Short mmCIF file of N, CA and C and ligand atoms in Angstrom, two decimals:
data_model
loop_
_atom_site.label_atom_id
_atom_site.label_comp_id
_atom_site.label_asym_id
_atom_site.label_seq_id
_atom_site.Cartn_x
_atom_site.Cartn_y
_atom_site.Cartn_z
N UNK A 2 193.76 176.54 283.32
CA UNK A 2 195.50 175.90 282.48
C UNK A 2 195.87 174.02 282.29
N UNK A 3 197.27 174.01 281.30
CA UNK A 3 197.61 173.13 281.04
C UNK A 3 198.45 173.26 280.08
N UNK A 4 199.29 172.61 280.73
CA UNK A 4 201.30 173.00 280.00
C UNK A 4 200.41 172.99 278.60
N UNK A 5 199.53 172.05 277.14
CA UNK A 5 199.33 172.45 276.14
C UNK A 5 199.17 173.98 275.71
N UNK A 6 199.37 174.65 276.92
CA UNK A 6 198.50 176.24 276.34
C UNK A 6 199.62 176.67 275.20
N UNK A 7 200.37 176.45 275.34
CA UNK A 7 201.78 176.82 274.96
C UNK A 7 201.75 176.67 272.90
N UNK A 8 201.77 175.81 272.58
CA UNK A 8 201.40 175.49 271.35
C UNK A 8 199.92 176.12 270.95
N UNK A 9 198.64 176.73 271.71
CA UNK A 9 197.84 176.80 270.93
C UNK A 9 197.64 178.24 270.45
N UNK A 10 196.95 178.13 269.62
CA UNK A 10 196.99 179.70 268.57
C UNK A 10 197.63 179.69 267.19
N UNK A 11 197.47 180.30 266.48
CA UNK A 11 197.68 180.43 264.89
C UNK A 11 198.67 181.22 264.68
N UNK A 12 199.79 180.01 263.49
CA UNK A 12 200.70 180.26 263.40
C UNK A 12 201.22 179.85 262.00
N UNK A 13 202.03 180.13 261.92
CA UNK A 13 202.49 180.74 260.09
C UNK A 13 204.16 180.31 259.72
N UNK A 14 203.27 179.84 258.20
CA UNK A 14 204.99 178.89 258.72
C UNK A 14 206.43 180.18 258.32
N UNK A 15 207.16 179.85 258.36
CA UNK A 15 207.70 180.96 258.54
C UNK A 15 209.88 180.16 257.57
N UNK A 16 209.77 179.42 257.89
CA UNK A 16 210.88 179.10 257.06
C UNK A 16 210.98 176.80 257.24
N UNK A 17 211.24 176.72 255.82
CA UNK A 17 211.55 174.81 255.89
C UNK A 17 213.30 174.77 255.40
N UNK A 18 213.37 173.51 255.30
CA UNK A 18 214.43 172.89 255.15
C UNK A 18 214.88 171.37 254.77
N UNK A 19 214.91 171.22 253.78
CA UNK A 19 215.37 169.84 253.96
C UNK A 19 213.28 168.82 253.66
N UNK A 20 212.95 169.65 253.58
CA UNK A 20 211.47 169.79 253.77
C UNK A 20 211.15 168.54 252.50
N UNK A 21 212.17 168.68 251.06
CA UNK A 21 211.31 168.27 249.85
C UNK A 21 212.43 166.45 249.86
N UNK A 22 213.91 166.30 250.23
CA UNK A 22 213.73 165.18 251.52
C UNK A 22 213.17 164.16 251.89
N UNK A 23 212.83 164.84 253.01
CA UNK A 23 211.99 164.29 254.16
C UNK A 23 211.21 162.89 253.03
N UNK A 24 210.49 164.17 251.74
CA UNK A 24 209.64 164.36 251.36
C UNK A 24 209.42 162.99 250.25
N UNK A 25 210.20 162.72 249.95
CA UNK A 25 211.18 161.90 249.11
C UNK A 25 211.24 160.47 249.71
N UNK A 26 211.58 160.64 251.21
CA UNK A 26 212.10 159.23 252.06
C UNK A 26 210.70 158.91 251.93
N UNK A 27 209.26 160.22 252.89
CA UNK A 27 208.52 159.19 252.54
C UNK A 27 207.76 158.35 251.71
N UNK A 28 208.37 159.02 250.90
CA UNK A 28 207.30 158.26 249.25
C UNK A 28 206.33 158.77 248.43
N UNK A 29 206.32 160.17 248.66
CA UNK A 29 205.49 161.70 248.35
C UNK A 29 206.36 161.22 246.54
N UNK A 30 205.24 161.21 245.45
CA UNK A 30 205.92 161.90 244.35
C UNK A 30 206.10 163.43 244.12
N UNK A 31 206.41 163.01 242.90
CA UNK A 31 207.21 164.20 242.51
C UNK A 31 205.52 165.16 241.73
N UNK A 32 204.75 165.29 241.66
CA UNK A 32 204.10 166.73 241.68
C UNK A 32 204.21 166.67 243.04
N UNK A 33 203.00 165.99 243.96
CA UNK A 33 203.00 166.77 245.34
C UNK A 33 203.84 166.57 245.82
N UNK A 34 205.20 166.55 245.94
CA UNK A 34 206.05 167.14 246.45
C UNK A 34 206.67 168.67 245.36
N UNK A 35 206.76 169.03 245.10
CA UNK A 35 206.21 170.44 244.22
C UNK A 35 205.34 171.61 244.61
N UNK A 36 204.33 170.69 245.16
CA UNK A 36 202.84 172.21 245.29
C UNK A 36 202.93 171.88 246.16
N UNK A 37 204.00 170.75 247.26
CA UNK A 37 204.01 170.77 249.17
C UNK A 37 204.91 172.04 249.79
N UNK A 38 205.42 171.70 248.33
CA UNK A 38 207.03 172.62 249.15
C UNK A 38 207.10 173.91 248.63
N UNK A 39 205.86 174.20 248.04
CA UNK A 39 206.15 175.01 247.32
C UNK A 39 205.43 176.20 248.80
N UNK A 40 203.82 175.27 249.35
CA UNK A 40 203.01 175.82 250.04
C UNK A 40 203.58 176.45 251.85
N UNK A 41 202.78 178.03 252.05
CA UNK A 41 202.64 177.71 253.58
C UNK A 41 201.63 178.14 253.82
N UNK A 42 201.22 176.72 254.55
CA UNK A 42 200.96 176.63 255.70
C UNK A 42 200.76 177.69 256.80
N UNK A 43 199.71 177.98 257.36
CA UNK A 43 198.94 178.44 259.01
C UNK A 43 199.02 176.94 259.22
N UNK A 44 199.29 176.84 260.23
CA UNK A 44 198.98 175.29 261.16
C UNK A 44 197.80 176.49 262.36
N UNK A 45 196.55 175.76 262.00
CA UNK A 45 195.87 176.85 263.69
C UNK A 45 195.60 175.30 264.55
N UNK A 46 196.16 175.62 266.36
CA UNK A 46 195.73 174.49 267.48
C UNK A 46 195.46 175.25 268.29
N UNK A 47 194.47 174.50 268.37
CA UNK A 47 193.26 174.36 269.91
C UNK A 47 192.99 172.79 270.42
N UNK A 48 192.42 173.61 271.48
CA UNK A 48 192.30 172.74 272.66
C UNK A 48 190.70 172.87 273.10
N UNK A 49 189.99 171.98 273.07
CA UNK A 49 188.46 171.47 274.38
C UNK A 49 188.31 170.32 275.00
N UNK A 50 188.96 170.32 276.43
CA UNK A 50 189.10 169.32 277.40
C UNK A 50 190.15 168.60 277.11
N UNK A 51 189.95 167.17 276.85
CA UNK A 51 191.50 166.59 276.20
C UNK A 51 191.38 166.39 274.62
N UNK A 52 190.77 167.28 273.70
CA UNK A 52 190.60 166.61 272.32
C UNK A 52 191.50 168.22 272.10
N UNK A 53 192.75 167.86 271.42
CA UNK A 53 193.46 168.57 270.65
C UNK A 53 193.40 168.71 268.90
N UNK A 54 192.68 169.79 268.58
CA UNK A 54 192.63 169.65 267.48
C UNK A 54 193.91 170.61 265.85
N UNK A 55 194.75 169.70 265.86
CA UNK A 55 195.88 170.84 264.53
C UNK A 55 194.71 170.74 263.12
N UNK A 56 194.73 172.14 262.44
CA UNK A 56 194.54 172.67 260.94
C UNK A 56 195.96 173.07 260.98
N UNK A 57 196.59 172.31 259.24
CA UNK A 57 197.08 172.90 258.37
C UNK A 57 196.41 172.98 257.17
N UNK A 58 196.00 175.14 256.83
CA UNK A 58 195.65 175.32 256.08
C UNK A 58 197.00 176.03 254.58
N UNK A 59 196.51 175.45 253.65
CA UNK A 59 197.52 176.44 252.56
C UNK A 59 196.41 176.24 251.15
N UNK A 60 197.06 176.55 250.26
CA UNK A 60 196.47 176.83 249.07
C UNK A 60 196.64 174.99 248.76
N UNK A 61 196.37 174.16 247.76
CA UNK A 61 196.40 173.24 247.71
C UNK A 61 195.75 171.91 248.47
N UNK A 62 196.12 172.34 249.74
CA UNK A 62 195.06 171.66 251.26
C UNK A 62 195.50 171.66 252.33
N UNK A 63 193.74 171.98 252.38
CA UNK A 63 193.61 172.48 253.83
C UNK A 63 193.08 170.66 254.85
N UNK A 64 193.48 170.25 255.93
CA UNK A 64 193.87 169.42 256.45
C UNK A 64 193.66 169.20 258.26
N UNK A 65 192.37 168.83 258.93
CA UNK A 65 193.26 169.17 259.77
C UNK A 65 192.25 167.61 260.71
N UNK A 66 193.05 167.69 261.67
CA UNK A 66 192.86 166.22 263.03
C UNK A 66 192.64 166.54 264.29
N UNK A 67 192.51 166.29 264.34
CA UNK A 67 191.18 165.91 266.71
C UNK A 67 191.64 164.77 267.05
N UNK A 68 192.24 164.56 268.33
CA UNK A 68 192.98 163.27 268.88
C UNK A 68 192.90 163.64 270.25
N UNK A 69 193.18 162.62 271.01
CA UNK A 69 192.99 162.95 272.57
C UNK A 69 194.48 162.45 272.63
N UNK A 70 195.44 163.06 273.08
CA UNK A 70 196.79 161.93 273.51
C UNK A 70 196.88 160.99 274.38
N UNK A 71 198.13 160.07 273.66
CA UNK A 71 197.91 158.99 274.22
C UNK A 71 196.63 158.08 273.36
N UNK A 72 196.27 157.85 272.72
CA UNK A 72 194.64 157.50 271.87
C UNK A 72 194.95 157.18 270.40
N UNK A 73 195.63 156.44 270.00
CA UNK A 73 195.59 155.90 268.86
C UNK A 73 194.37 156.39 267.77
N UNK A 74 194.63 156.80 266.98
CA UNK A 74 193.44 157.47 265.55
C UNK A 74 193.83 157.35 264.13
N UNK A 75 193.10 157.09 263.49
CA UNK A 75 194.10 156.59 262.13
C UNK A 75 193.03 157.98 260.96
N UNK A 76 194.32 158.84 260.53
CA UNK A 76 194.46 159.22 259.27
C UNK A 76 194.66 159.57 258.36
N UNK A 77 194.59 160.13 256.91
CA UNK A 77 195.26 160.27 255.77
C UNK A 77 196.35 162.30 255.98
N UNK A 78 196.31 162.09 255.46
CA UNK A 78 197.90 162.57 255.52
C UNK A 78 197.93 163.39 254.04
N UNK A 79 198.24 164.18 254.06
CA UNK A 79 198.46 165.16 253.04
C UNK A 79 198.14 165.05 251.30
N UNK A 80 199.56 164.33 251.44
CA UNK A 80 199.72 163.24 250.48
C UNK A 80 199.27 161.74 249.97
N UNK A 81 197.49 161.54 251.62
CA UNK A 81 196.71 160.93 250.49
C UNK A 81 197.23 159.48 251.40
N UNK A 82 198.39 159.86 252.66
CA UNK A 82 198.75 158.24 252.91
C UNK A 82 197.42 157.70 254.05
N UNK A 83 196.68 156.47 254.08
CA UNK A 83 196.23 155.92 255.67
C UNK A 83 196.86 156.05 256.39
N UNK A 84 196.85 156.63 257.53
CA UNK A 84 198.42 155.91 258.77
C UNK A 84 197.30 155.78 259.75
N UNK A 85 198.27 155.17 260.85
CA UNK A 85 197.65 155.16 261.67
C UNK A 85 198.66 155.53 263.22
N UNK A 86 198.14 156.83 263.70
CA UNK A 86 198.31 158.18 264.64
C UNK A 86 198.45 157.55 266.19
N UNK A 87 199.59 157.80 266.55
CA UNK A 87 198.84 158.01 267.66
C UNK A 87 200.61 159.53 268.41
N UNK A 88 199.56 160.23 269.63
CA UNK A 88 200.47 161.76 270.00
C UNK A 88 200.40 161.96 271.08
N UNK A 89 201.34 162.24 272.16
CA UNK A 89 201.76 162.59 273.26
C UNK A 89 202.90 163.38 273.85
N UNK A 90 202.40 163.58 274.49
CA UNK A 90 203.78 165.06 275.59
C UNK A 90 204.60 164.73 276.25
N UNK A 91 206.02 165.07 275.45
CA UNK A 91 207.06 163.97 276.10
C UNK A 91 207.45 165.10 276.83
N UNK A 92 208.19 165.95 277.55
CA UNK A 92 208.54 165.94 279.00
C UNK A 92 208.11 167.77 277.54
N UNK A 93 207.31 167.98 277.22
CA UNK A 93 206.92 169.68 276.58
C UNK A 93 207.34 169.97 275.77
N UNK A 94 207.24 168.25 274.81
CA UNK A 94 208.03 168.43 272.77
C UNK A 94 206.24 167.47 272.84
N UNK A 95 205.83 167.78 272.09
CA UNK A 95 204.57 167.92 271.15
C UNK A 95 205.03 166.46 270.22
N UNK A 96 204.78 165.21 270.05
CA UNK A 96 205.60 163.51 269.43
C UNK A 96 204.33 162.84 268.83
N UNK A 97 204.33 163.73 267.17
CA UNK A 97 203.35 162.38 266.99
C UNK A 97 203.91 161.30 265.84
N UNK A 98 203.37 160.02 266.11
CA UNK A 98 204.11 159.02 265.20
C UNK A 98 203.13 158.25 264.95
N UNK A 99 203.58 158.33 263.17
CA UNK A 99 202.65 157.76 262.01
C UNK A 99 202.66 156.35 261.54
N UNK A 100 202.88 155.73 261.26
CA UNK A 100 202.53 153.64 261.02
C UNK A 100 201.55 153.91 259.91
N UNK A 101 202.00 152.64 258.48
CA UNK A 101 201.46 152.65 257.75
C UNK A 101 202.79 151.67 256.86
N UNK A 102 202.14 150.73 256.76
CA UNK A 102 202.74 150.04 255.33
C UNK A 102 204.30 149.22 255.87
N UNK A 103 204.72 148.70 257.29
CA UNK A 103 205.52 149.30 258.01
C UNK A 103 206.53 149.40 257.72
N UNK A 104 206.51 151.59 258.06
CA UNK A 104 207.28 151.90 257.75
C UNK A 104 206.82 153.71 259.18
N UNK A 105 207.53 154.35 259.27
CA UNK A 105 207.40 154.87 260.85
C UNK A 105 207.90 156.33 260.39
N UNK A 106 206.92 157.57 260.34
CA UNK A 106 208.13 159.09 261.23
C UNK A 106 207.17 158.89 261.82
N UNK A 107 208.39 160.04 262.22
CA UNK A 107 207.64 160.86 263.31
C UNK A 107 208.11 162.82 263.35
N UNK A 108 207.09 162.82 264.01
CA UNK A 108 206.85 164.83 263.48
C UNK A 108 206.63 165.25 265.31
N UNK A 109 208.07 165.96 265.27
CA UNK A 109 207.89 166.99 266.83
C UNK A 109 207.29 167.94 267.07
N UNK A 110 206.92 168.97 268.22
CA UNK A 110 206.77 170.25 267.21
C UNK A 110 206.87 169.86 269.15
N UNK A 111 207.18 171.34 268.74
CA UNK A 111 208.44 172.44 269.92
C UNK A 111 207.84 173.59 270.15
N UNK A 112 207.97 174.31 271.06
CA UNK A 112 207.56 175.82 271.51
C UNK A 112 209.75 175.90 271.90
N UNK A 113 210.11 177.54 271.42
CA UNK A 113 210.38 177.17 271.36
C UNK A 113 211.27 178.97 270.78
N UNK A 114 211.85 179.67 271.43
CA UNK A 114 211.74 181.86 272.15
C UNK A 114 209.98 181.14 271.67
N UNK A 115 210.00 182.14 270.48
CA UNK A 115 208.26 182.87 270.04
C UNK A 115 208.09 182.20 268.42
N UNK A 116 209.01 180.81 268.09
CA UNK A 116 208.55 179.76 267.59
C UNK A 116 207.93 179.10 267.96
N UNK A 117 207.68 178.48 266.95
CA UNK A 117 206.56 176.17 267.19
C UNK A 117 208.14 175.94 266.18
N UNK A 118 208.91 174.41 266.07
CA UNK A 118 210.11 173.97 265.76
C UNK A 118 209.04 173.07 265.34
N UNK A 119 209.11 172.74 264.01
CA UNK A 119 208.49 171.06 263.30
C UNK A 119 209.82 170.36 263.32
N UNK A 120 209.85 169.33 263.27
CA UNK A 120 210.63 168.38 263.04
C UNK A 120 210.15 167.33 263.02
N UNK A 121 210.73 166.58 261.60
CA UNK A 121 210.40 165.55 261.06
C UNK A 121 211.23 164.67 260.32
N UNK A 122 211.10 163.32 260.83
CA UNK A 122 211.74 162.36 261.08
C UNK A 122 212.06 161.20 260.71
N UNK A 123 211.96 161.18 259.35
CA UNK A 123 211.99 159.20 258.84
C UNK A 123 212.96 158.84 258.20
N UNK A 124 213.91 157.72 258.28
CA UNK A 124 214.87 156.72 258.80
C UNK A 124 215.99 158.30 259.47
N UNK A 125 216.66 158.40 258.67
CA UNK A 125 218.11 159.46 259.32
C UNK A 125 217.82 161.10 258.52
N UNK A 126 216.38 160.81 257.84
CA UNK A 126 216.40 162.25 256.47
C UNK A 126 215.52 163.23 258.09
N UNK A 127 215.53 164.05 258.32
CA UNK A 127 214.87 165.28 259.53
C UNK A 127 214.26 166.78 257.73
N UNK A 128 213.34 167.72 258.11
CA UNK A 128 213.20 167.95 257.72
C UNK A 128 212.60 169.18 258.97
N UNK A 129 212.86 170.29 259.24
CA UNK A 129 213.06 171.05 260.05
C UNK A 129 211.86 172.54 259.45
N UNK A 130 210.29 172.80 259.95
CA UNK A 130 210.22 173.46 259.79
C UNK A 130 209.27 174.52 260.59
N UNK A 131 209.63 175.84 260.44
CA UNK A 131 210.03 177.08 261.66
C UNK A 131 208.77 177.77 261.40
N UNK A 132 207.36 177.84 262.38
CA UNK A 132 206.44 178.65 262.63
C UNK A 132 206.73 179.44 263.87
N UNK A 133 205.81 181.14 263.51
CA UNK A 133 205.89 182.07 263.53
C UNK A 133 204.32 182.30 264.69
N UNK A 134 203.82 183.27 265.35
CA UNK A 134 202.73 183.25 265.36
C UNK A 134 202.04 184.25 264.53
N UNK A 135 200.66 184.15 263.83
CA UNK A 135 200.49 185.13 262.31
C UNK A 135 200.07 185.64 263.23
O1 Q4X B 201 202.55 171.51 259.38
C1 Q4X B 201 203.95 170.86 258.05
O2 Q4X B 201 204.38 171.69 258.29
C2 Q4X B 201 204.00 169.54 257.87
C3 Q4X B 201 203.70 169.40 256.40
C4 Q4X B 201 203.00 169.90 255.66
O3 Q4X B 201 202.91 170.84 256.17
N1 Q4X B 201 202.73 169.22 254.32
C5 Q4X B 201 201.73 169.69 254.00
S1 Q4X B 201 200.77 171.86 253.56
C6 Q4X B 201 200.61 171.65 251.68
C7 Q4X B 201 201.47 169.80 251.51
C8 Q4X B 201 201.84 169.33 252.68
C9 Q4X B 201 201.78 167.46 252.57
N2 Q4X B 201 202.48 167.27 252.85
C10 Q4X B 201 203.30 165.28 252.46
C11 Q4X B 201 203.90 164.77 253.10
C12 Q4X B 201 205.42 164.83 253.94
C13 Q4X B 201 204.18 164.87 255.22
N3 Q4X B 201 203.04 165.81 251.39
O4 Q4X B 201 202.20 167.51 251.55
C14 Q4X B 201 200.40 169.34 250.19
C15 Q4X B 201 198.78 170.21 250.15
C16 Q4X B 201 199.11 171.54 250.59
F1 Q4X B 201 200.36 171.81 249.11
F2 Q4X B 201 198.67 172.57 249.61
C17 Q4X B 201 199.51 172.36 251.78
C18 Q4X B 201 203.92 167.10 256.45
O5 Q4X B 201 204.70 167.32 257.89
C19 Q4X B 201 205.40 167.15 258.28
C20 Q4X B 201 205.16 168.84 259.40
CL1 CL B 202 200.74 161.70 277.26
#
């Protein structure tokens, strides 16, 4: 066992707040914002040795990353940005930083009660997305 075990499983989106404005701040265009905002993704998190895999599955995109904590990787995001990403575990929170074109956004994933809470921030704009077990 590892501490990341509290994240493993299949999670379904149950609430979203401020996501459209977060996407505006990131630079997502209108049509992608509208279709992304309508999505009700599942998030599937698994661990195999040191490798963590996070899959986002929805109508109009399935996206998957695999990574080792603390080891930078190239990522193509659901909105088609090419970013450099690093994910670490800090005090029980998975912290995902994405860097591209002199910009940065941080995505935190935390277990709170029976929820997986995703907090997304860029400059001062935050969105909170709440998942429950599927
Ligand atoms: O995992 C999340 O809840 C989180 C995100 C998420 O779900 N984004 C989703 S799902 C999903 C889409 C996107 C999406 N994002 C973005 C920009 C904001 C990154 N552009 O498109 C597009 C296609 C789809 F509609 F078919 C399905 C995004 O960032 C934070 C955590
Ligand atoms: Cl770490």
